[PDB]
Amino acid sequence: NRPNRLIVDEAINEDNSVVSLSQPKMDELQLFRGDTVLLKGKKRREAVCIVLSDDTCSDEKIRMNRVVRNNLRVRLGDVISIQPCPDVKYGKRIHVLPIDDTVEGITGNLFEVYLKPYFLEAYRPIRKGDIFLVRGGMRAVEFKVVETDPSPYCIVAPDTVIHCEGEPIKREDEEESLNEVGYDDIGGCRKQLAQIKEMVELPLRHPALFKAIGVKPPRGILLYGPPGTGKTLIARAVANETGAFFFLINGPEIMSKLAGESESNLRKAFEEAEKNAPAIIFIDELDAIAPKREKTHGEVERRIVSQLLTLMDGLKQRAHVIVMAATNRPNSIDPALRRFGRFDREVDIGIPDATGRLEILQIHTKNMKLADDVDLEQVANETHGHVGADLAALCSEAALQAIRKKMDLIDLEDETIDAEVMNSLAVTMDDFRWALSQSNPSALRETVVEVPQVTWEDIGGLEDVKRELQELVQYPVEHPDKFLKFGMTPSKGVLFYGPPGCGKTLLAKAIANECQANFISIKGPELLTMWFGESEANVREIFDKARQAAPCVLFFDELDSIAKARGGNIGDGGGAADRVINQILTEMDGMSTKKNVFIIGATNRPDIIDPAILRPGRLDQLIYIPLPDEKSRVAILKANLRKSPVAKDVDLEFLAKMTNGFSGADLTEICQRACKLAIRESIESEIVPEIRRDHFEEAMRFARRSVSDNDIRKYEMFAQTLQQSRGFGSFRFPS
Amino acid sequence: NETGAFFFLINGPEIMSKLAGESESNLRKAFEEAEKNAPAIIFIDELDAIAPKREKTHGEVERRIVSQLLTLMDGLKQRAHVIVMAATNRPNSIDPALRRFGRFDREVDIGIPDATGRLEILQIHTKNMKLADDVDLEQVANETHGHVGADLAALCSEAALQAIRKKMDLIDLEDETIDAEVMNSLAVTMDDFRWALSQSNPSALRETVVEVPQVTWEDIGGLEDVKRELQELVQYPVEHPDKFLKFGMTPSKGVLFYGPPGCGKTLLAKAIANECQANFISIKGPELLTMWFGESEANVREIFDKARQAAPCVLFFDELDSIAKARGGNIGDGGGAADRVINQILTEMDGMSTKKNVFIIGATNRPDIIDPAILRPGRLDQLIYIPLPDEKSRVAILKANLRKSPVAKDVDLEFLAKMTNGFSGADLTEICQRACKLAIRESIESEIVPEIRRDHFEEAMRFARRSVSDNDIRKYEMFAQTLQQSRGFGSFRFPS
Ligand SMILES: Cc1cc2c(C(N)=O)cccc2n1-c1nc2c(c(NCc3ccccc3)n1)COCC2
Numbered sequence A: 001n002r003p004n005r006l007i008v009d010e011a012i013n014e015d016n017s018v019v020s021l022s023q024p025k026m027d028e029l030q031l032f033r034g035d036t037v038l039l040k041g042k043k044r045r046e047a048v049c050i051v052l053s054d055d056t057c058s059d060e061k062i063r064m065n066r067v068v069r070n071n072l073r074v075r076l077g078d079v080i081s082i083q084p085c086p087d088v089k090y091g092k093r094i095h096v097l098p099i100d101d102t103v104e105g106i107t108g109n110l111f112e113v114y115l116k117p118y119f120l121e122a123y124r125p126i127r128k129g130d131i132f133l134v135r136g137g138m139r140a141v142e143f144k145v146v147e148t149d150p151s152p153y154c155i156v157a158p159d160t161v162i163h164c165e166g167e168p169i170k171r172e173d174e175e176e177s178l179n180e181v182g183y184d185d186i187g188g189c190r191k192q193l194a195q196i197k198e199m200v201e202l203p204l205r206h207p208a209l210f211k212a213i214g215v216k217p218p219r220g221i222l223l224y225g226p227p228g229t230g231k232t233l234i235a236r237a238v239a240n241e242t243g244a245f246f247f248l249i250n251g252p253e254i255m256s257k258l259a260g261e262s263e264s265n266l267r268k269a270f271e272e273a274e275k276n277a278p279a280i281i282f283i284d285e286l287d288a289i290a291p292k293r294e295k296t297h298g299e300v301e302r303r304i305v306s307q308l309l310t311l312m313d314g315l316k317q318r319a320h321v322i323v324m325a326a327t328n329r330p331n332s333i334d335p336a337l338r339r340f341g342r343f344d345r346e347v348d349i350g351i352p353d354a355t356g357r358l359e360i361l362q363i364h365t366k367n368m369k370l371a372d373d374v375d376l377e378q379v380a381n382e383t384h385g386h387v388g389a390d391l392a393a394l395c396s397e398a399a400l401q402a403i404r405k406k407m408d409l410i411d412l413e414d415e416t417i418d419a420e421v422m423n424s425l426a427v428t429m430d431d432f433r434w435a436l437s438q439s440n441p442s443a444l445r446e447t448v449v450e451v452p453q454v455t456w457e458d459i460g461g462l463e464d465v466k467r468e469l470q471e472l473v474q475y476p477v478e479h480p481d482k483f484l485k486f487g488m489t490p491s492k493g494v495l496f497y498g499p500p501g502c503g504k505t506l507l508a509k510a511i512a513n514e515c516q517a518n519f520i521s522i523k524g525p526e527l528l529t530m531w532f533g534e535s536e537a538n539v540r541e542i543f544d545k546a547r548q549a550a551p552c553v554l555f556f557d558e559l560d561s562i563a564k565a566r567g568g569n570i571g572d573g574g575g576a577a578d579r580v581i582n583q584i585l586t587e588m589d590g591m592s593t594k595k596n597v598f599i600i601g602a603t604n605r606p607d608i609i610d611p612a613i614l615r616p617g618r619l620d621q622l623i624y625i626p627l628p629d630e631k632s633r634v635a636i637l638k639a640n641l642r643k644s645p646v647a648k649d650v651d652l653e654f655l656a657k658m659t660n661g662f663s664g665a666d667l668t669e670i671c672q673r674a675c676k677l678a679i680r681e682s683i684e685s686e687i688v689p690e691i692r693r694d695h696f697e698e699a700m701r702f703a704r705r706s707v708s709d710n711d712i713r714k715y716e717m718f719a720q721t722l723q724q725s726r727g728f729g730s731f732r733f734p735s
Numbered sequence B: 001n002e003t004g005a006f007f008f009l010i011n012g013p014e015i016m017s018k019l020a021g022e023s024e025s026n027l028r029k030a031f032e033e034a035e036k037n038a039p040a041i042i043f044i045d046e047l048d049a050i051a052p053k054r055e056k057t058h059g060e061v062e063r064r065i066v067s068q069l070l071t072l073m074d075g076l077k078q079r080a081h082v083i084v085m086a087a088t089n090r091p092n093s094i095d096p097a098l099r100r101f102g103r104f105d106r107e108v109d110i111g112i113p114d115a116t117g118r119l120e121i122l123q124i125h126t127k128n129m130k131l132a133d134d135v136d137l138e139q140v141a142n143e144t145h146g147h148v149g150a151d152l153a154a155l156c157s158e159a160a161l162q163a164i165r166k167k168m169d170l171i172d173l174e175d176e177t178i179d180a181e182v183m184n185s186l187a188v189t190m191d192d193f194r195w196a197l198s199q200s201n202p203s204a205l206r207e208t209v210v211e212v213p214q215v216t217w218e219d220i221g222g223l224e225d226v227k228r229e230l231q232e233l234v235q236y237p238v239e240h241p242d243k244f245l246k247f248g249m250t251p252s253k254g255v256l257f258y259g260p261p262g263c264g265k266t267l268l269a270k271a272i273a274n275e276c277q278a279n280f281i282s283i284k285g286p287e288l289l290t291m292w293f294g295e296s297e298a299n300v301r302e303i304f305d306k307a308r309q310a311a312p313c314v315l316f317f318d319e320l321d322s323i324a325k326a327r328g329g330n331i332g333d334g335g336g337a338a339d340r341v342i343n344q345i346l347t348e349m350d351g352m353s354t355k356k357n358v359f360i361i362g363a364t365n366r367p368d369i370i371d372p373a374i375l376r377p378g379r380l381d382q383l384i385y386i387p388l389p390d391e392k393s394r395v396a397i398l399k400a401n402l403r404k405s406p407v408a409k410d411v412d413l414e415f416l417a418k419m420t421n422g423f424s425g426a427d428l429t430e431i432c433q434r435a436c437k438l439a440i441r442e443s444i445e446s447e448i449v450p451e452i453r454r455d456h457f458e459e460a461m462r463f464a465r466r467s468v469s470d471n472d473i474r475k476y477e478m479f480a481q482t483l484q485q486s487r488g489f490g491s492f493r494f495p496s
């Protein structure tokens, strides 16, 4: 079967011309890490690149870049043959010129100022009839060769000369512009984008197989998340890189036109897409199409909603059309649109984490050069409530300040702006310091679903809790098989209790990292808001988005907030049962045990917690979080001081030994007071940048202890209320 | 298709899709074109989208179309054979004027298939795709309970794409026409189905599950006192209808039993349903307390409606005292023990027919706060007490918990059940769970044995709780021979 062709996929490397393979790949073709490789394809064209060795990408797979996928005219799901080509090449004369589509506003020489600097120390090959793309110079421009030395023998070298004629040649329809959006342009959405690959690549890349088998492909995908998360360029990229006819309808334009032709327009949208098979239809605004919850107004609204329902219901085999849609909330859509055959597959995307946000900055700043002291990693750390469009706007906004701080002194007012100054436009760090000050982000109060960064290693002590948490949620995650072998269902959730300020939230975060699971935190105010507001559909989406992000962990902070607000143990004439806890009970009863979703309840007063939530099957597992011991207190001190200059003589072991009945909050305020004293001494001494032993010794005087002994006694009475290890302590079997 | 009748399908959204004025004409001419194709059959797919006459009250054309349908179905004389079937989600989501005589008199309610019902629905959708010798569809239809018939139809295809994707990467056969000599080798694997139940999010999860249980009286040991009265209280009117008309005694409408928590009240009700071969409907506490807080009290209407159409059925109310606990209990507020939800249940139970085989079972752990009116004769006059499991019944609880675990020969469950006396079913359950946890932990740590050993149970026996106190047993008994009263007339002699 000629075992030489392999499938093509996307490369995670950010390099321009780098091809990554697996370990048993170059050992068969006896090629080194800097040899010459020749690749072929359709249209009777060849290619040449540089093979790079990598053993971390995958097990047996070849990577392949975007700048050459369009150059060789290759699309996904195709076969590619690779063979070594040890041919000595040497370029002598070159002649490249850009296309008159991206050179607007550029004058003067442009060959000895951009092309010469980037060619050196690269030795990149080039074949005849190729459109390479280069990023930099505050723009995205390309060049095309029309006449040079006979192919091949093309090697870049500083000794090579170049020349120009002065007449750009327009591009044709055979090639595709690389300025559009592809898979490499998506940053942060890794797990969510991975799903669309296994749902839209089968029907669009292999049509004859679907008109051969009886499998019904999905007829609709609903994307989610707040505006700006990137629901549109995802749909445009999965169309641009799949060769499917992308047809965009926004959703407000349907209501923009007169009543009577709006239905006809999105009707004919479906037939014009069908004849362009394979096709892909994306509806940008859908909550503005079917808000069938409180509107109940407008004869044409229902007519358009039903017209869409009919157009998507009659999606038989016929041709390959995929109808994706975007909206903000799951409940803001007509439930009749969620039926089978209209929207069966739903993918929810959200705010990218720090790692997800880091990869979204450089994609938007690849054109603007940075300085040696400008790092994008630290700027994606203090921001947590920024949507993907927020940072896209922030990059440009910093760019105007960067150019404004120099145009005042340059004072070059003319009709046409010379292209010899963009090379000197380097952004500074102060350009970004102002960027996070006046920028007001949109998505700030939402469910942050991110994997934490706190592990068990950075938590000292608490071996008693470490051992039971690891055997209660980690075992069903890392060893599913040993549970079916023993016929034991995993526990649904655990509620732990303890004095305030002892790290219950951090413990839940740490157990999420051990299982490599997502983490969702619901604090007290979010739980008590729906109690006062009499709006109790909010737990529905909480439990919905907790289960779609499998595997996840659900954490409820200060669960006793409603009981405290109602009175507690007695309060009013009623008991300890309310409506919000009832909704949580209903949602937990209906969950599937085979899923890896896990609910963790945190409380400081477990005596006022409703007994029904602790019933077996919901939160039967109760563990007690005590005060940190000597080993765990050092961890709290060093976590607080990990960002501060600590002197060598400042011994944290002794400080943690001295404080015994101290909570995490008590150590936190000790560290904060020491830092305040150090800052004040540094400020007053100006008229030293190191925290000294005296700072901690003096701040140790105002040492509080917020947790009293009576509290520890009342928590214990609760603890071996449920321990009861009496009676059957000594048992001997007969034989 | 199998009756040779002209099938004409109208969805229901297409009526609202077209302009106002011809939509009425289209579903009008739909009826005459069906009549001349006699015999005919008309099915309306979306009907809740046609007549949502409960909260809409908006749109002149909506009422016009609803009335046009009412006129088209009212004028259904003999003439020709046309049958107008329709589909909708809820009974209350339909215009009540459509339920009149001559429009929709016959109603059939279908629901989620059970494990047996789901098993026969898999192979019909996978008859074309060949399976392996280790792929069994029975075990995959067991852990799923909230899957609609379309859910598994989608799941089969979804597993098919994974099955072909795991091999197309290595086959690497890219061409225009795909050869037919490879489908014969497309065999689905069990791992194709393991991933299928992970990312698939089912739709119907929070609904009334109406299925026949699988727990019988044989697997329940002991409880002969309750076995004898339950068998003579609901089984007799089901298996011997004639002996009741012969003796002129009406069957009891329902029985409420009480007992300490975690003793198997739900399992007892399930077992008595299998003995009578009757359907079982369970209503837990949260579903009862949701409508109390929500002030939405039409929910008991459909509960009692779907409990009576599935004749014969058994209706089970779990923790009936939930509303009383939420309101305070014996005293609580200035009010008594009467509320709105229990009032609706009383109204629905008073209006039921005794000749039907529907049966209501109430379960509670605090019968002192139960409203007295629900225990009035004719509604729940029969009260039976569920005690702690005895030695014979505790072995059943242990073996039910351990029926899926590797039990060693030396592990004697009879002795373990003998040792624990005042232990509830929950206490034995946590003992078994703790022993399984210890065995799993030892197996995991020993890797760096696949059998539960005697030591696992012996060590886990140390943390043996007893959640039910003696004061609780005393307070339940005070309630029990509160209503026993076998004094006074204990010795009677007739004259002759
Ligand atoms: C700033 C900080 C404040 C704080 C508090 C508090 N009431 O201020 C309570 C518990 C932990 C706390 N931390 C804290 N924060 C961190 C860590 C850490 N050490 C491990 C730990 C966790 C729970 C328990 C013990 C010790 N402690 C470890 O690395 C991540 C951040």
Ligand SMILES: Cc1cc2c(C(N)=O)cccc2n1-c1nc2c(c(NCc3ccccc3)n1)COCC2
Residues within 6 Å of the ligand: B215, B219, B220, B221, B261, B262, B263, B264, B265, B267, B268, B389, B393, B394, B396, B397, B400, B401, B424, B425, B426, B427, B429
């Ligand atoms: C897992 C299980 C837990 C449990 C509990 C509990 N609070 O954990 C209470 C009562 C019965 C329980 N079962 C249980 N489950 C089953 C059976 C069975 N034995 C019969 C029985 C029923 C009620 C009573 C006695 C004994 N017991 C029998 O086969 C079906 C499943």
Ligand SMILES: Nc1ncnc2c1ncn2[C@@H]1O[C@H](COP(=O)(O)OP(=O)(O)O)[C@@H](O)[C@H]1O
Residues within 6 Å of the ligand: A185, A186, A187, A188, A189, A226, A227, A228, A229, A230, A231, A232, A233, A360, A387, A388, A389, A390, A392
């Ligand atoms: N997750 C993301 N990855 C890459 N770019 C993004 C992302 N989210 C937003 N952007 C950028 O923000 C800009 C605005 O996106 P926008 O059209 O608001 O997305 P949507 O239509 O989904 O709200 C786009 O040009 C896009 O490049």
